[PDB]
Scaffold this active site. Structure first.
Site, PDB file in Angstrom:
ATOM      1  N   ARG C  74      22.212  24.771  -8.434  1.00 58.20           N
ATOM      2  CA  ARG C  74      21.506  23.867  -7.529  1.00 58.20           C
ATOM      3  C   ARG C  74      20.612  24.656  -6.584  1.00 58.20           C
ATOM      4  NH1 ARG C  74      22.279  21.759  -2.074  1.00 58.20           N
ATOM      5  NH2 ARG C  74      21.580  19.575  -1.954  1.00 58.20           N
ATOM      6  N   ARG C  75      21.098  25.820  -6.169  1.00 60.74           N
ATOM      7  CA  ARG C  75      20.357  26.670  -5.259  1.00 60.74           C
ATOM      8  C   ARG C  75      20.643  28.126  -5.589  1.00 60.74           C
ATOM      9  NH1 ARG C  75      18.926  22.230  -4.126  1.00 60.74           N
ATOM     10  NH2 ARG C  75      18.716  21.155  -2.105  1.00 60.74           N
TER      11      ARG C  75
END
Ligand SMILES: O=C(O)CCC(=O)C(=O)O
Ligand SMILES: O=C(O)CCC(=O)C(=O)O
Ligand SMILES: O=C(O)CCC(=O)C(=O)O
Ligand SMILES: [Fe+2]
Ligand SMILES: [Fe+2]
Ligand SMILES: [Fe+2]
Lengths: 264, 264, 264
Positions: C74-75
């Protein structure tokens, strides 16, 4: 960083020793062997033997009586054979089996809660609702006999304890960007931190991916929170959780759904 | 136990005959052929032929008009080709096709509800909200042409009715711990009990795993409950469902989510 | 119908030109190249180079600091390597990297919202809660380096914008019942319509399946609605969504769950 899988003595962690080392391990690796936790080859023997026996000598009628109507592998027998159990609603083939496995489960459950309690302590974490309510949860124990053998994934548990019997080293986990061997240790249990540890501690704990490479047996004990375990939505997003949750707080059930999902 | 896939006459089950045998089949096998249910090769012919024709002679423009904007295989055409439909919002290429398939769907729906009604009767089960509300549900019909071919799994339906056209026997289900052949029967429809049968009857019905081995066609009719079908959480845990549901009661939606999941 | 993947100039769509062609493309194909949208090879260069550099020269310590405790992609960094980011809670290895990628993300986000705004306009769609609230959402940007390579699927986004660097044409999408090549276009970005476009416009937009065939890099930007995006349940069922939702209206969260699911 040293890509070695460290070992921690539970008694020692409870004494308040090796805290910085422990914190660093949780953060950068999320896995370690645990000694002095009431779990050794001695326990694994009785349970292994009697269940192995069952797998090799139980009649088709005996296995049926201990098999669930739905093949969820949550309780009872599953045709790599498997035997699962939890805190209740268990299926035991005999009184001897029950006595052995109930004792084995309690031992596993006690060590899991204990190590998890230390994980919470080291990270100065106080789960919403308190530590005890959080730890009195929904664990699941799965014993598998294996006569890749299991795709890569991370566990969604708080912590997962694994006891194995050697063959070749099948179990492997990513450490320092490389899959490292995780061989049996008759004196220790292997502890994998799962996504819930990461979530509850605000990202202070890593949930490492692992897999089984291609006979052996593995006793996997998942320490899973309750459906009502509550956490901060903003904080979850801060450490990597790609949540689609409206509001400031959410429960495990809101996030995972109405059915436990153990790996991902 | 005899690992034979038994056959039951629907008319006979409705007469109140073979109850113990029926109960035992549901419990230990969860599958059987069903005769005298208004479904034979005679019905399967008109529907098969006209849809097969469509698969082989329909223009790219005709297939487009009967294809959904989202490829969910819920309604219309899907490129092993497939044609799906439900109680409404259907996509039919022509009036003749519509008349044939609407009749075919109603017949399939009537037999499914009928056999399910018997499954509830034999197990003395009264679904929360009553039998009728439970049976007036959300069925899905999928016709597939196949010019393993389908991984192992169990159905999450109440019951699933399957009509096939022979090739080699592709369909197989686990019976007595072994995958048994389930060949075509121009005079009968094959009934698979799904997870919802297990759930609603409190574990009195088994949901057997099955798969397709590696041309043939299969007409699969899923009898699925409504999003609001309600059940006891404690009871679900008692028969193998690894639920993460807070509270005493829950709906199908709380358990499965916001999108129907047909197999697992 | 012509199975060609059309190209639309964003400036031109905003001028109110090619509306019928645009509507027809959305409906029958659900994909197209987009020019004049502030996104060209010129932008893709700075971001690609600096991240490629990082993938090849970043120390194991540097990559750790930009890797999330949970491997959700996601990151931050993910070991086909990947680098992801969103509107916040990002992990950047350096100030230079941050400045480049923040600018790159904003450009991507602006073009996605812009084209989506046109998709809503052309179909005369007014999302529940208004257009702006709908478009100020939860996008996710994933840059991947690839030294089938990705199974078939459709995106659950509103729209997905893709910028590639050529090798052989790996990316392919189904158009007219056949997988068509989707090669790089230094002057244009490839736009895939996702399930949410189909849902919000009431079935006026198609969400095409696509896949990656078997070095290259791809910058994939998902424009995803908020957990609270609300829609009509009856209307969702009218265009192919096999929903298990009680009631007349539902949110993205009720349908998809508590964790974003990007493809299906
Ligand atoms: O069999 C093993 O050693 C590991 C099993 C595992 O990771 C799991 O069940 O998640
Ligand atoms: O094609 C068949 O015969 C079986 C299909 C099946 O089990 C399913 O669609 O769940
Ligand atoms: O790598 C590509 O070009 C496509 C990736 C894609 O479709 C996705 O990430 O959904
Ligand atoms: Fe695991
Ligand atoms: Fe099935
Ligand atoms: Fe995609």
């Amino acid at each position: 960083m040293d890509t070695t899988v460290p070992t921690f003595s539970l008694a020692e962690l409870q004494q308040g020793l090796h805290q910085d080392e422990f914190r660093r391990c949780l953060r950068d690796k999320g896995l370690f062997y645990l000694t002095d936790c009431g779990l050794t080859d001695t326990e694994l023997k009785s349970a292994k033997d009697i269940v192995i026996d069952f797998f090799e000598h139980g009649s088709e009628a005996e296995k049926r009586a201990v098999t669930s109507p739905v093949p969820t592998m949550r309780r009872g027998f599953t045709g790599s054979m498997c035997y699962s159990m939890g805190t209740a609603d268990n299926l035991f083939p005999s009184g001897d089996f029950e006595r052995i496995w109930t004792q084995y489960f309690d031992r596993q459950y006690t060590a899991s809660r204990a190590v998890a309690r230390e994980v919470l302590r080291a990270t100065g974490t106080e789960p919403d609702g308190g530590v005890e309510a959080f730890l009195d949860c929904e664990p699941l124990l799965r014993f598998r006999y294996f006569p890749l053998r299991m795709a890569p994934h991370y566990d969604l548990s708080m912590v997962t304890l694994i006891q194995q019997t050697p063959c070749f080293v099948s179990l492997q986990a990513e450490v320092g960007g490389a899959f490292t061997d995780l061989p049996y240790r008759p004196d220790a249990v292997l502890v994998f931190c799962g996504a819930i540890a990461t979530l509850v501690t605000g990202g202070q704990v890593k949930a490492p991916r692992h897999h089984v490479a291609a006979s052996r047996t593995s006793s996997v004990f998942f320490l899973r929170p309750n459906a009502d375990f509550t956490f901060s939505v903003p904080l979850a997003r801060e450490c990597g959780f790609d949540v689609s949750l409206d509001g400031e707080t959410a429960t495990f059930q809101d996030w995972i759904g109405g059915n436990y999902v153990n790996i991902r």
